[model samples]
Target: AGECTPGQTKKQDCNTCTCTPTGIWGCTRKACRTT
Candidate 1:
């Protein structure tokens, strides 16, 4: 697995994410990008 980053955020529509204890967001392949 790879460390998450703020860039790969927006994991989902009904899901919410917060900065991890390490102050970094994890990366995910299911990330959803909207305009």
Candidate 2:
């Protein structure tokens, strides 16, 4: 897990993994679970 975006908090739950255009932040693994 990399640095979060502006106005985003660390406690925020990431249920979906995505890539950022800046490539400065993203998750390489699927750590989030979907219901």
The 0-to-1 C-alpha lDDT of every candidate, in the order given, reads 0.49, 0.43
Clashing pairs in 2: none
Off by over 4 Å in 1: 1-12, 27-35
User: Estimated TM-score per prediction?
Assistant: 0.26, 0.24
Flag clash pairs in model 1.
4-25, 4-26, 4-27, 5-25
| Candidate maximizing TM-score | 1
Q: Report the poorest 10 consecutive residues by lDDT, candidate 1.
A: 26-35
Give residue 35's lDDT in candidate 1 (0 to 100). 20
1-35 in candidate 1: lDDT tens per residue? 44654344454454555545555764334444552
In candidate 1, position 23 carries an lDDT of 50
Candidate 2 similarity to native, TM-score? 0.24
